[PDB]
Structures are given as structure tokens and as C-alpha cells.
Scaffold this motif. Structure first.
Motif, mmCIF file in Angstrom:
data_model
loop_
_atom_site.group_PDB
_atom_site.id
_atom_site.type_symbol
_atom_site.label_atom_id
_atom_site.label_comp_id
_atom_site.label_asym_id
_atom_site.label_seq_id
_atom_site.Cartn_x
_atom_site.Cartn_y
_atom_site.Cartn_z
ATOM 1 N N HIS A 114 -3.403 45.219 41.762
ATOM 2 C CA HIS A 114 -4.406 44.190 41.891
ATOM 3 C C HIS A 114 -3.900 43.100 42.832
ATOM 4 C CE1 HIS A 114 -7.311 41.148 41.213
ATOM 5 N NE2 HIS A 114 -6.679 40.511 40.241
ATOM 6 N N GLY A 153 -15.336 42.033 45.316
ATOM 7 C CA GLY A 153 -15.843 42.152 43.972
ATOM 8 C C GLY A 153 -15.812 40.832 43.208
ATOM 9 N N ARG A 154 -14.677 40.568 42.577
ATOM 10 C CA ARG A 154 -14.504 39.379 41.767
ATOM 11 C C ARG A 154 -14.985 38.056 42.331
ATOM 12 N NH1 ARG A 154 -10.154 42.509 41.165
ATOM 13 N NH2 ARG A 154 -9.511 43.311 39.101
ATOM 14 N N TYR A 208 -13.455 40.662 33.627
ATOM 15 C CA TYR A 208 -13.531 40.478 35.072
ATOM 16 C C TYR A 208 -12.212 40.304 35.801
ATOM 17 C CZ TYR A 208 -18.567 39.353 34.521
ATOM 18 O OH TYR A 208 -19.934 39.361 34.308
ATOM 19 N N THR A 241 -18.303 56.819 43.227
ATOM 20 C CA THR A 241 -16.969 56.407 42.858
ATOM 21 C C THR A 241 -16.144 57.546 42.320
ATOM 22 O OG1 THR A 241 -17.804 54.228 42.279
ATOM 23 C CG2 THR A 241 -15.614 54.822 41.497
ATOM 24 N N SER A 257 -24.025 48.511 40.807
ATOM 25 C CA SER A 257 -23.288 49.389 39.906
ATOM 26 C C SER A 257 -24.169 50.233 38.981
ATOM 27 C CB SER A 257 -22.311 48.567 39.061
ATOM 28 O OG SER A 257 -21.733 49.374 38.041
ATOM 29 N N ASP A 277 -11.822 47.490 50.303
ATOM 30 C CA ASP A 277 -12.080 46.408 49.368
ATOM 31 C C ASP A 277 -10.768 46.116 48.634
ATOM 32 O OD1 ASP A 277 -11.610 48.050 47.132
ATOM 33 O OD2 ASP A 277 -13.762 48.321 46.680
ATOM 34 N N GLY A 278 -10.769 45.104 47.784
ATOM 35 C CA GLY A 278 -9.570 44.776 47.046
ATOM 36 C C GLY A 278 -8.802 43.582 47.585
ATOM 37 N N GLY A 279 -8.751 42.515 46.787
ATOM 38 C CA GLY A 279 -8.007 41.321 47.148
ATOM 39 C C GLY A 279 -8.405 40.549 48.380
ATOM 40 N N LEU A 325 -18.535 37.794 41.687
ATOM 41 C CA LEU A 325 -18.738 37.762 40.238
ATOM 42 C C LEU A 325 -18.537 36.355 39.687
ATOM 43 C CD1 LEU A 325 -17.094 40.724 38.295
ATOM 44 C CD2 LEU A 325 -19.287 39.612 37.861
ATOM 45 N N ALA A 355 -19.902 46.762 44.024
ATOM 46 C CA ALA A 355 -20.434 46.976 42.686
ATOM 47 C C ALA A 355 -19.562 46.413 41.592
ATOM 48 C CB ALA A 355 -20.615 48.451 42.440
ATOM 49 N N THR A 356 -20.180 45.684 40.672
ATOM 50 C CA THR A 356 -19.460 45.117 39.539
ATOM 51 C C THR A 356 -20.326 45.269 38.292
ATOM 52 O OG1 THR A 356 -20.308 42.939 40.210
ATOM 53 C CG2 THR A 356 -18.041 43.466 40.818
ATOM 54 N N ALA A 357 -19.922 46.177 37.413
ATOM 55 C CA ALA A 357 -20.653 46.420 36.168
ATOM 56 C C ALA A 357 -20.694 45.188 35.250
ATOM 57 C CB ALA A 357 -20.018 47.584 35.424
ATOM 58 N N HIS A 403 -10.321 50.413 43.077
ATOM 59 C CA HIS A 403 -11.072 49.771 42.010
ATOM 60 C C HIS A 403 -10.546 48.373 41.709
ATOM 61 C CE1 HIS A 403 -14.101 50.476 38.873
ATOM 62 N NE2 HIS A 403 -14.192 51.718 39.305
ATOM 63 N N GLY A 404 -10.147 47.648 42.746
ATOM 64 C CA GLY A 404 -9.629 46.306 42.534
ATOM 65 C C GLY A 404 -8.427 46.295 41.615
ATOM 66 N N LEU A 451 -23.170 51.094 36.042
ATOM 67 C CA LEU A 451 -22.962 50.420 34.764
ATOM 68 C C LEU A 451 -23.423 48.956 34.766
ATOM 69 C CD1 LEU A 451 -21.597 52.969 34.079
ATOM 70 C CD2 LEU A 451 -19.428 51.770 33.825
HETATM 71 C C1 LIG Z 1 -15.441 43.348 36.444
HETATM 72 C C2 LIG Z 1 -15.481 44.480 37.474
HETATM 73 C C3 LIG Z 1 -16.365 45.578 37.301
HETATM 74 C C4 LIG Z 1 -16.395 46.625 38.278
HETATM 75 N N1 LIG Z 1 -17.282 47.696 38.122
HETATM 76 C C5 LIG Z 1 -17.362 48.701 39.039
HETATM 77 C C6 LIG Z 1 -18.328 49.794 38.846
HETATM 78 O O1 LIG Z 1 -19.099 49.869 37.865
HETATM 79 N N2 LIG Z 1 -18.345 50.773 39.861
HETATM 80 C C7 LIG Z 1 -17.497 50.769 41.034
HETATM 81 O O2 LIG Z 1 -17.584 51.658 41.875
HETATM 82 N N3 LIG Z 1 -16.604 49.725 41.158
HETATM 83 C C8 LIG Z 1 -16.505 48.711 40.232
HETATM 84 N N4 LIG Z 1 -15.601 47.649 40.395
HETATM 85 C C9 LIG Z 1 -14.746 47.637 41.567
HETATM 86 C C10 LIG Z 1 -15.401 46.920 42.766
HETATM 87 O O3 LIG Z 1 -16.519 47.631 43.283
HETATM 88 C C11 LIG Z 1 -14.360 46.679 43.864
HETATM 89 O O4 LIG Z 1 -13.750 47.941 44.162
HETATM 90 C C12 LIG Z 1 -13.291 45.614 43.519
HETATM 91 O O5 LIG Z 1 -13.823 44.563 42.686
HETATM 92 C C13 LIG Z 1 -12.673 45.051 44.772
HETATM 93 O O6 LIG Z 1 -11.596 44.181 44.321
HETATM 94 P P1 LIG Z 1 -11.668 42.622 44.329
HETATM 95 O O7 LIG Z 1 -12.312 42.222 43.049
HETATM 96 O O8 LIG Z 1 -10.243 42.119 44.378
HETATM 97 O O9 LIG Z 1 -12.409 42.177 45.550
HETATM 98 C C14 LIG Z 1 -15.512 46.565 39.444
HETATM 99 C C15 LIG Z 1 -14.626 45.440 39.584
HETATM 100 C C16 LIG Z 1 -14.600 44.414 38.637
HETATM 101 C C17 LIG Z 1 -13.643 43.272 38.870
#
Ligand SMILES: Cc1cc2nc3c(=O)[nH]c(=O)nc-3n(C[C@H](O)[C@H](O)[C@H](O)COP(=O)(O)O)c2cc1C
Ligand SMILES: Cc1cc2nc3c(=O)[nH]c(=O)nc-3n(C[C@H](O)[C@H](O)[C@H](O)COP(=O)(O)O)c2cc1C
Ligand SMILES: Cc1cc2nc3c(=O)[nH]c(=O)nc-3n(C[C@H](O)[C@H](O)[C@H](O)COP(=O)(O)O)c2cc1C
Ligand SMILES: Cc1cc2nc3c(=O)[nH]c(=O)nc-3n(C[C@H](O)[C@H](O)[C@H](O)COP(=O)(O)O)c2cc1C
Lengths: 393, 392, 392, 393
Positions: free
Chosen positions: B55, B313-314, B45, B181, B129, B290-292, B317, B97-99, B254-255, B131
Motif C-alpha cells: 500500500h 481510489g481512496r 477504506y 478485476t 464497482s 493506480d495505487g498511491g 473516497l 472502483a471503490t465498493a 488493489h491499492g 460491490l
Molecule cells: C475501500 C476500497 C474498496 C475497493 N473496492 C474495489 C472493488 O470493489 N473492485 C475493484 O476492482 N477495486 C476496488 N478497490 C481498488 C481500487 O479500484 C484501486 O485499485 C485502489 O483504490 C487504488 O489505490 P489508491 O486507493 O491508493 O489510489 C477498492 C479500494 C478501496 C480503498
């Protein structure tokens, strides 16, 4: 709340407080205070909103400014007196309003900052908070000099009657001006404070009306003869609005970083604002003050060179009052006074009127940066140079 | 893997978790999570690609932007609701989405973030997600409110039949949109992840590395669901998306889990919206980022620059892992309040009023790298000291 | 003051001083000095005004300048000699005036820096402070070579007779120039100094705070010695100096011991020389700089920007304190070699060839102040780790 | 020198070296090496000139560059092969010359980096130092593949006969090119190294002629048929001079920060140079290489996008060779190869030729900063936010 070991320790440290004249700069009062105040008081006084970015930025932005001092100038005599809101003052700075002063000084509270501002040879304006611990009359009555001036900081109440009466009252009591605060329509989230209370519209309180508007200020202007200053302006557009409705001034401020986080350093807003006031043919229509992160005399000099009428300080005085009381406040005043005079001499000017922008190097005022994150592996593995060592004993 | 000492310690820490309403901000869930999750879950994660520069940069770039708040404005009432992909939403943000959510929450997984998004007064969109640990069916079935919306994040499989079917399926299930994605044609190298387990290998037939614009154009014909291209990192691709007519894009990397040194989406957003206008494409697309994002003010900045919605995301989570569905609800409450509280101090009363004149963008470009430290000079130097208490 | 434990420790460290030729760079003398000098001496020598921002900035600004070295140039021979105030000197640098040298060297004081400057093959100009521990006579008499030159730094006294006489005296004694200091009309606040001793007070009748340009003009008439105005901090004053005809100025801020936030002299130098040319004042003045110079490359940069000479204060003070006259000679050798060695890699063979095209000045203005650290975000974050050795 | 406790400790750590395929990135070899090499070797290999500013800057400048990746591009197949100095190579990088390899690898020295560059499926060019521990013939003879290429790095001797003969010799031996180093006419001061030897024209050695000039290069060009590359160029003017006298290329380099301190990051010099070569109608007349601080595949990609023909690496390979020998070098090669391929995929391109500047964000390439010094008192006294805590056990 405050434990027995907390109490025991602090009580002992308070008896080890060093002699007041061993205090060299404003940071010294802050350190002592941070070790002696109750958890609650320290938390209340030292906190800012959320990540406290703006709180620190208020101070750091002063460092994006350098001096271009004049030399070979007769600086034997120096004068740091000036005028603010119609009154002559011995110094270019003042004590900004700080609610609940009894938290750090239980017996005297605000009465002690009042004595501190007038008991010495240097009489310093004191802004009195609406949310003060003491009552207005006792704070004003505690003023030891008739020459010292006091200003009343006002929060407009949802119940306007209360406000109208309070104004009549402080005006009768003799305050020289009204600073109405507009950066707190809602309460900022001070998290250090919140953690202690574990030992959305919840941030609103009818006590401070979130519906205050310019119209309201225009009407207040009609109900009183006291100069009015809008405290808490954070953009140039509102300085211009204030000038247009005719109030006496504004204080470029963000509540010491206790409200909106990521509001800009007032010193930066000041730099941007004064030139624009001239372009708009509003030069001098307003008296502009700044507060936030000011800790050194050179901080004050920079503000004055950019056109500030006066510079306010909150926390430093709060800490001085809490650790040494009225005498601490007087000391603080003396320290700031001397830092200003000594650096004015080195700057090569002899009066507040001579503090102008050509004395400043503003070329890097905009270098407010955020570095690329650290390459931790590269830096961790790297081994820097070392200094030579003494022989093996 | 997870040792006995590890397990023993974490189990004890989990019983010392503080009361959910003592949680002040999103970082608190992160700290707790970092001490309680299994090495594997935490590493999975919390990691990013390679040096994890992007990141962190995703978050830090928000700090290159400051506010120019309006004062003396009636802010008694405030509204942070808005509309995304055709649906009205209570807040301007969403759960990205977070797999493998079961890594941090073994029993409920994604079903718990769904309950969290709809069990309270604030219904938040949840992106599911491909996944995920749980099945689409069970995650959508777990939604407690009919008013809450769910989006399906899709990875196009090398076997297009599998994808075509999955689309018909999630569409039948009721998801309001498809986020496809495109920033993971290959798996990024999360080194924290890799250490625990002690170049054609980065390609799995699950996520087809051959996806192109044509493929998206065709997907547009096989479904009625709005389509959003998730993972755009340059202005040229936002323009291409607008030109093929999809519903939106999410400016994302993707974070920081994919290409290291991709820019902060907030920065790409700042550059993009004005260009969309110049190209006469204003509003043709809905742009998300998204992201941070960790504070309400981060969200407000994105909104002032023109983002339709902001994903996280995180943070979610971590909340889900430590406190389950209630944690997710708590996180939602925290972010909701941070946004309302700062919108008031910003001096506006609705999402529509969040415009760029509220931001100071003059130093958006001050992304720096300092000259290396002069170690000898700094080591030998002795800085000023504070006064001291008398000797006891 | 200095305790028994203090004394006992330092006396023991002084016997463990490493052999003088194990000293690699100027910082080494600083480290040794910092461990062996008395609290009073160290505090007196190492301190700067208030927060000591300028003291450090003086040095750091040199790092905003990079080199654009020439290659494939015959650099077998190199010459770093030059001319200053009418005299030929073996090196492009000098020892700036430092009052109370007996604080660090009780027996010899300034007499030892004099011997150090002339006892070796490299004769370096020595500027003698008005506030020196030793008398002018004895410091000049201590000079071992007739080829070495000495300059007298002057503070104008409120009692001008004292000054007029002192000038006739040092002139009779043979000093080659008068450097009149103008950045200390009042004493700066060195707080490290003040703590140990536990606004009209900053004015002493010794240094007349009423000195003006007129005064300098008159001094120009009372002596035949070249006059240099020491302590100029802005371009306007360099121009005034050139206009009243003195021989030069030294762009300086008293080693950061006076006005805090005065700029790095190197920066003021970069801005000044081109302006002197525009004002048709090229070469009318000889411009020197001091402050934070610690490496030969610092000197080369100053020279490439047009400085006639570069002064050093503290480094020599520390060498003199720990190793006496031989230390000063050693320091001189170290700096001499750093300059020659880097001049070769720069691709030039004489001081005259050091011009600005050799420097990259494009980032001279990148003097920054970062946005405050996001402590929670950084505290909670866990960076990448290096692989580890197998478990023993 | 190396003590008994030093020796005892390192010998034990060497037996605890982790399995070669547990090595994830180039920094891992550096850490292991820093713990196992002799003081002398580590000092020799890891040091830079004076304050080592340029050494670190070489690497950090890569971080002033960001990517603008293409998405929705078929990236199933990727090709990172290219051509350098007339030869086809499997990768866009190479092993730059590093003198005294036996310091870290006593038995094999350079012979082991040679086996490492050819024993795997990826054959990587190896530049052989003049000051190598092993002899030219044994280094060239150790090459396991006929497909792998080797280059000879030359220092021109004050005794030109020696140089003329050495050139005839390496040419007979089969090296594909001559890289003549020009950034070391004098020896740089590596202080970590100097401290150990305590356990002006002294920096010159007739072995390396400080009088080498362009004329000398022009004549060398006549005495050999091997492509010539001038290694150690640090300004655009000299790249242009090189192009005008007709040599085959230059390597923008500063000797890994081991010579002139404050020389610029070669990546920055590269950014400035290629556009100027086009303006001067010299596009492609020269092949331009860069080295220094390259540690990640994305570092390499940035260089290639700015027009580099190839990217060299010194220390990383030295550390791999010292800790794991030939197999380490092969591993290093595999790690770099994969980082390049994987990020090329995410960049959205499929071949080295497609790596162009529009893939880079160069807008902040010039943000090489030096912050105002830290306000120590202000920051020391300040107390930042804290994270929530677990309940008391
Ligand atoms: C553990 C984890 C699993 C993730 N899985 C997916 C996924 O299966 N599909 C997808 O489009 N993005 C996935 N992401 C990316 C998130 O959708 C998102 O872009 C990202 O977490 C945003 O960053 P942040 O964690 O800093 O907010 C994942 C991110 C994390 C941290
Ligand atoms: C503990 C504390 C209480 C405050 N209370 C008030 C208040 O009641 N009314 C007001 O207008 N400002 C209030 N302020 C803000 C100050 O008037 C001023 O803006 C600020 O303290 C200046 O920042 P500084 O503390 O960094 O100098 C308060 C500040 C602090 C630190
Ligand atoms: C302990 C000390 C005493 C000094 N005394 C004098 C003085 O009496 N007259 C003067 O013109 N400059 C004086 N200076 C300033 C130096 O001449 C010079 O400007 C400064 O040391 C250059 O800075 P640096 O020490 O970083 O090289 C003194 C500096 C120090 C550190
Ligand atoms: C220990 C060491 C020895 C070196 N010896 C030589 C040499 O003999 N000839 C040469 O042209 N370059 C030499 N170099 C420089 C390299 O060829 C190359 O410029 C440098 O290592 C690239 O920097 P990097 O180590 O950061 O990758 C040496 C570098 C190191 C670290």
C-alpha cells in the motif's frame, strides 16, 4: 493575520536575540528567524513547492559526496577569491535574488543586504530581484563600496517595453550582469503560504511572461552589452542550448525548490553536465553557477570541485538580514568565508583553481534512495538494547 | 461498534469541517476523513493487506523518479485532455472502483461521486464497482452530464448467468467499458478491519477464484464493450492480455489490499512499456495504473512512462465521505490544477508530449532496506544544537 | 562555566557509578561519562567537526560489512596476539593519542591510561599525545610493566628545534615509535566546544601548517624510531608514504574532528590494500585504522581487510574519566573478549587467519542518502497496531 | 530478580490476556509475551548477540524481496504440504529448537509445544533442543499424534560417550532426524540477559565441544541411520562441504542472531547458495532449510521460492507457548498456515512445488544499506508541511 499574542511574543524574543558573534553557523539565523518573523514572512521565505521534496533534496544531495583530501601539503596560505562574469570577487559565493526582503526587514529590505555585502573586508556579489521590495536605484545606491558588484535578476514582462526599459535602466545604474529567470513561467504552489491566506491559470501573471523562449533570449542578447545568464536550468540539454546561443552562463537551479517539485538537486545536475560540456567541445564556453540548499562551506567546495564558477545562497542570507539586518548579512558572509577557508586547508589545496574533481569521492553520488516502508508491528514490538544505569539513589 | 463518545465527538468535528475551498491537497480530505468517519468505515477504506507494505510502496515508488524539465518553452497554453478506451476525456485521470461508498457517505454513496465527476467543467471517468452500495441503474442515472463517461468494474461470479446478465444490463445502461478485476480471486487480509470485528474462509462464491484467461477470451465474445484486465502485476501478464486482444490492462494490486509485497505499479509500468515495444506490441493495449497516486506530479510521471490513464481510489473516497459530491468535484479540481501547473514547469503543452526523456529514471531501482539501527551508539550520541535566545 | 547545580548533580551521580564489573560494553562508559563529566570535558571529548557527519560515518561504515564465518572448525584455542612496528603485542588494538586527558581525569590524566594498559594480564600499546596534560616523562614513568609499549604522537612545531629536541627526548625515554599527525595543519571547528565558550584563527604556531613530505623525509634521517604518518585519508597518500619509506600510516581523520566528509577509514582501507598489492608495495607499509571502532567485530573487520592494528580514542578516554586506570583496564578486557569470542564464531584461530574471504564486501559501497520524507503522506497514515489486553 | 510489583502486575495482565482467537498475527503473541513473561524469561528469549544487528537483519532482508504474482489462474484449490527429511508434512514450516521452554511455560515446557504441533488438523514438525527443560522421553511421549514428526537437535559433548548414548536413545525414542548445531562452539553474548544477572573462555562449556570438525560429522554419520542435518551454516562454502560429505541437509542459520553478530540474513545466503549448488552439480544432493526472523507467511513463501525445503521459526512459537500454552502453539500454527495459503492463492500457484524463483523480483536483494548520518541541525530547524485543521470549536 499576525495576532496580538503573536506580536507580543515575537517582540519579546527579538529583544532576547543573542549577540551577533555568538552565531556559529547559518542554521542559527534560520532558527532565530523561524521564531521571530511574522507568520506571513516565515511562510513566504521558508516554503517550497508542494511537498517540498526538491527543496530538501537540493541540500541532501551534497551529502552523497565525500572528500579525498591531500595531506602533508603546505596550507599556511589559502586563497578563496575567484572571478565571475568578468569581475574579480573575494569569495566563490554570492547572494541570490530574493523578492520581498521587506517582509523580514521592513525598514531596510534589500538595501540592507547590499550594505551587508560591501561594508566588511569581504565584498560579496549581490543579485537583485525584479520583485524586490525596494527600487533598483535605491538598492544600488545603498552599496557602500565601489568595489562590490551587483547583478540584476530579470523576469521578462508580457509587456516587453517595460522589460526593455528596465534593462536600459539597470545597465545605466551599473549592474554587472543580467540573470534572466526561466523556471517560473508559472507560479509554484507554496502551501504553507496558502494556508495563511485562510485567516489553474491563476498561477500565471502577465508580469512574468509564460511565453519566453530561446528566441527571446537571443534578441535580448542583442539589446544589451551586459553578460546574460539563464537562471533556472534543470537538465543538461538546456545548458548545451544556452552555450550554443552564446549567453555568458547559466545557473543550475530550481528556484530553491519553490517551483517544480521533483526537479533534481542542482549539484547532481552539475556533476552530470560539466563532463558532457567537455565531450561536446563546449568546455568553458559557459560559466556555470548552482544554488539551492547550500548551507556549509563544504557544500560550496563540492560545487567548485565539480566545476561551478560560483555558488549562490538564498534563504540563509534572507534570515540573517531579517534578524540582524545589514550586520547579520555581514556575519553570514564571514561564517561562510571561514568555513570555506578552513576546509580548503584540510582538503589540502590553496586556491579555487585547485578545487578539482579528483578531490571528491563521487562513487555514491547516485545513491538517492527510497526505503521499503517500515514494518511497524515488527519494530513496535521489538525492544532494543539499553545502556547501563547509575545506582539507585 | 461505534460508541456514544465516538459519535458525539465525530458529529461535533463534522460541524467544524473547514470550508471546502480551504482544502489545499488530497491529503487534507484524508486527514479530515480519518477524524470523522466511523471506525468501521475508516478501517474499511484505509486498510491494506497484512503489513500494508505494498500500500505504502505504491506511493513511495513515485519518489524514485525525478524530472528533467525543459525551460524557455512557451507554456502559456496547456492541454491535459486525452483519450481513454475510445472516449475523449478532459483529464488524464479517473475515479477507480471503490465498493461500499455508503460507509463514508450513507445517503448518496456512489451517486455522489457520479455527480462530482460531471457537475463541474471537468468531466472525469468514473469506474463503478460491482460491490457498490448503490445499484448500477441509480449510479448511472445520477450522472449529471451526458458527456461524462462511466466504466463498470466487474467481478466474475461462480454463477456465470448472474455475470452474463449483469453485463447485458450495464451495457444496456450505457457504460463505456468493462474492467474485470483479477487480483482478488480471494480476499486479502485487512487487519485493521479484522480488529474491529472483535483459509477457505477468504473465498466467497461471489468472486470466482477459478477465473482464467479462457474465461476472458469468452467474455470478449459476449460483449461489444472494450474489456480491460484490472489487477495485472507482472510483465508476462500484460503480454498475455495483449495477445488475447483485450483493450487494456490496469497495472494494479488493489491499492495494496491484496498480496502484500506486490510491486509499485509505477515500477511495473516502467519495466513493461519498453518490453511491449520489443515484442512488437506497441499500442496494441492501453495501459492504466493506480495505487498511491496523490499528487499531479505522480500522474505526470505515470503518463511520461506511457500510461494511458491514472486511477485514484481512496482520495476520492475520502472527499466523497467528508464533503459529498462537492468534495469529489473539489478533489477533481485540485488534481486537475496540480497537473496543469506542473506540466507548465515541465515545459510541455499536451499529454502527448509527456515522454520518458522528461524523467530521470536512473534511480528507479533504489528501493532499499537499511541495516538495522545501532541503538546504543545512536542513543548515547548527542547531536549538534541550535543557538538559543538570551535568558528572559 | 560549570554551575553549582551542575557540580552538585554530577558529584552525586559519581557516587552512584555502578560497579566496574557491571560494565558490559564500551557504550556504557560513554553513557556514564556523558552524565558525569564537566560540560567542558564532555564537549571537548565528544565533539567532531561541523555537522559531525564523518565522526558518525567512521562507525557506521563498519556496518556495511558482514561476515562469512566458517563452521565445524576446532576453535577451542584462539590467539589474538600480533606484532606492530616491530613489537609483539597481546592484542590487535591500541589506545590512540588523546590530548588533555586531565579534563576527564584531573588527578592522573594520561598516567592512568598507562597504568591501565599494563596493570593487567593484557598489555596494550599506548599512543601518547604531544598535547597531553601530563609530561612525557611522567606518562612513560607511570607504565607498570616493562613489557608494555608506548608510542609518541608528534605534532611538528613551527619551531623545528623544539620538535628535534622533543624527539631526542622521547626516544631517550624509550617510546617504540613516532606517529606524526598530518590531518590537523589547522584546527577543526568543534561547535559543541565553541558554544560553551560563550579564518587565520584556526592556525596555531604549535602545529606547523607548512609540513610537507620533504619534512618527513628529513625526520626519517634524524631518528631511528619507526615513523608512522597518522591521518592519511586517500590511497595516493598511502602510496607516497610507502615510497618515501616510512614504517606505516594510520588511515584516520582524527575521529571526525577535522575535515567533515572525509570517508570512513575502514572504507579507505578496503580500497587501499588491494591497490598497494597492484603497485608492488605489499607489506612495505604497516597500515593502521582508527575512528568509530566500538566493538570487537569492528576490529575483526579491519583486521580481515589487512589492518596491522586498530586504534580507539574516545572509548578509552571515557573509561579513564569515569573509572580511572581500572576503567581503562576494564575497557581493555571488554574489547579483548569481544574479539576472541567472535573470532571463534568466525571460525579462525589467529590474527593471521583473518583474511578478506571471511568478509562479505558486496555492499561496502551502499552509503546512502534517502529522498526526503513525504511528511503529509506519512503523518496522515496510520500503521497497524498490536492486539491489546482485555479491559481491566 | 522478579519483584513483588513485577509479579503483581504480570499476574493481573495474564488474567486480561485476550481470547486466543482474537490473536491476528504472530506479533500479537510477542507483544503479550513481552508484557507477561518474567524479566529473566523475556530477556532469555528475546535477546540476540551484542548489538542484535543480525537478529533484526534476518527479518528485514525478507523485505528486499518482492513478488511477481500470476493472475487469471484457477486458485480455488491450494496445497501447502511438502516433504522434509523423508517424511510427508502438512506445511512447509516447523518449530525450531528452543532451549529452556519452561522459562516461559513452567508446568509444561516443551511438552506443550509438542501437543500444540499435533493436537490440531495440521501436524507440524517439532525440533527438540538438547538443552530443553523437559527430558527427551517426556517430550516425545507428549506427542498426541503418531503422524506428527519430531527431530532432535544435538550439541556434541566434549564427552563423546554422552553424545553417542543420547543419539542411541533419541533414535530408539523415534525422532526422525538429527540436527547437529555448529554455530555455537562458544556462547554468544546476549547483553539484555547479562544486565539482569546484576540484580573470555568463560563463554566455552565442555557441554558443547568447541573442537567439533567435519571429521566428527563424518563419523557421526556412521554411528546412526537417522538423516543428519548440519544446523547453523552461514556461507556457501560450508553448504558445499556438507553436500560433499553426504549429510542429508543443512539449515542456513545464525541461531536467531544469538551468536555472531553481522552474520548475514539466511534468506540472502539461501539466494546465493542454491544457484551455486547447481553449478557445482550438487542440485538436490542436500535439503536446505532456513530460519531466523520469519514472521509472516510471505516470508516463508519467499524462502520456498528460492529453494528452501522448509522454514523454521523459533521465538514466535516460544511466545505463543508461554502465553497460551499448547493451544497458543496450535493457534500460531493456524495463523501461519492461513497466511501461506492465502498468499499462495494471490501469488497464482497451487502447490509448494510451483513456488519457484520466477515468482520473485530479486533485483533489489542486495540493497542492504547504511545511510549517511543525519544532518541534525538542518532537519531540526526545518519545518515540514502541515495538514489542514478543523474549525475552532
Ligand atoms: C475501500 C476500497 C474498496 C475497493 N473496492 C474495489 C472493488 O470493489 N473492485 C475493484 O476492482 N477495486 C476496488 N478497490 C481498488 C481500487 O479500484 C484501486 O485499485 C485502489 O483504490 C487504488 O489505490 P489508491 O486507493 O491508493 O489510489 C477498492 C479500494 C478501496 C480503498
Ligand atoms: C523567499 C524567496 C524569494 C525568491 N525570489 C526570487 C525572485 O524574485 N527571482 C529569482 O530569480 N529567484 C528567486 N528566489 C530563488 C533564489 O534566487 C535561489 O534560487 C534560492 O533561494 C536558492 O535556494 P536556497 O534558498 O536554498 O539557498 C527566491 C527564493 C526565496 C527563498
Ligand atoms: C578528545 C580528543 C583528543 C585528541 N587528541 C589528539 C592529539 O593530540 N593527537 C592526535 O594525533 N590525535 C588526537 N585525537 C584523535 C585520536 O588519536 C583518534 O584518531 C580518534 O580518537 C579515533 O576516533 P574514535 O574516538 O572514534 O575512536 C584526539 C581525539 C579526541 C576524541
Ligand atoms: C530462547 C532461544 C533458545 C534457543 N536454543 C537453541 C538450542 O538450544 N539449540 C539450537 O540448535 N538452537 C537454538 N535456538 C535457535 C533456534 O533453533 C532458531 O535458530 C531461531 O530461534 C530462529 O530464529 P527466530 O527466533 O527469529 O525464528 C534458540 C533460539 C532462542 C530464541
Amino acid at each position: 493575520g499576525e495576532t496580538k499574542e503573536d506580536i507580543a511574543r515575537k517582540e519579546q524574543l527579538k529583544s532576547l536575540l543573542p549577540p551577533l558573534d555568538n552565531i556559529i553557523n547559518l542554521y542559527d539565523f534560520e532558527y532565530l528567524a523561524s521564531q521571530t518573523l511574522t507568520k506571513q514572512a516565515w511562510a513566504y521565505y521558508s516554503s517550497g513547492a508542494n511537498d517540498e521534496v526538491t527543496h530538501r533534496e537540493n541540500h541532501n544531495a551534497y551529502h552523497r559526496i565525500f572528500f579525498k583530501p591531500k595531506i602533508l601539503v603546505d596550507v599556511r596560505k589559502v586563497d578563496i577569491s575567484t572571478d565571475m562574469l568578468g569581475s574579480h570577487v573575494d569569495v566563490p559565493f554570492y547572494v541570490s535574488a530574493t523578492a520581498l526582503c521587506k517582509l523580514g526587514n521592513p525598514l531596510e529590505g534589500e538595501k540592507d543586504v547590499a550594505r551587508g555585502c560591501g561594508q566588511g573586508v569581504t565584498k560579496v556579489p549581490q543579485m537583485i530581484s525584479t520583485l524586490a521590495s525596494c527600487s533598483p536605484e535605491e538598492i544600488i545606491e545603498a552599496a557602500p563600496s565601489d568595489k562590490q558588484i551587483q547583478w540584476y535578476q530579470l523576469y521578462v514582462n508580457s509587456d516587453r517595453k517595460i522589460t526593455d526599459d528596465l534593462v536600459k535602466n539597470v545597465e545605466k545604474l551599473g549592474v554587472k550582469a543580467l540573470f534572466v529567470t526561466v523556471d517560473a513561467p508559472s507560479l509554484g504552489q507554496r502551501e504553507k503560504d496558502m494556508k495563511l491566506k485562510f485567516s489553474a491559470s491563476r498561477a500565471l501573471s502577465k508580469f512574468i511572461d509564460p511565453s519566453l523562449t530561446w528566441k527571446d533570449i537571443e534578441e535580448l542578447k542583442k539589446k544589451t552589452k551586459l553578460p546574460i545568464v539563464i537562471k533556472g536550468v534543470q537538465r543538461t540539454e538546456d545548458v548545451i542550448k544556452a552555450a550554443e546561443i552564446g549567453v555568458s552562463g547559466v545557473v543550475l537551479s530550481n528556484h530553491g525548490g519553490r517551483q517544480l517539485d521533483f526537479s533534481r538537486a542542482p549539484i547532481e545536475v552539475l556533476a552530470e553536465t560539466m563532463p558532457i560540456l567537455e565531450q561536446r567541445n563546449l568546455k568553458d564556453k559557459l560559466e556555470v553557477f548552482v544554488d539551492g540548499g547550500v548551507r556549509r562551506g563544504t557544500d560550496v567546495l563540492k560545487a567548485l570541485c565539480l566545476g561551478a564558477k560560483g555558488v549562490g545562497l538564498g534563504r540563509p542570507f534572507l534570515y540573517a538580514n531579517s534578524c540582524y539586518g545589514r550586520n547579520g548579512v555581514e556575519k553570514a558572509i564571514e561564517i561562510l568565508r571561514d568555513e570555506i577557508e578552513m576546509s580548503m586547508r584540510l582538503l589540502g589545496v590553496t586556491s579555487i583553481a585547485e578545487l578539482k574533481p579528483d578531490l571528491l569521492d563521487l562513487s555514491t553520488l547516485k545513491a538517492r534512495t527510497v526505503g521499503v516502508p517500515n514494518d511497524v508491528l515488527y519494530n513496535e514490538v521489538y525492544e532494543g538494547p539499553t545502556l547501563t544505569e547509575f545506582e539507585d539513589a
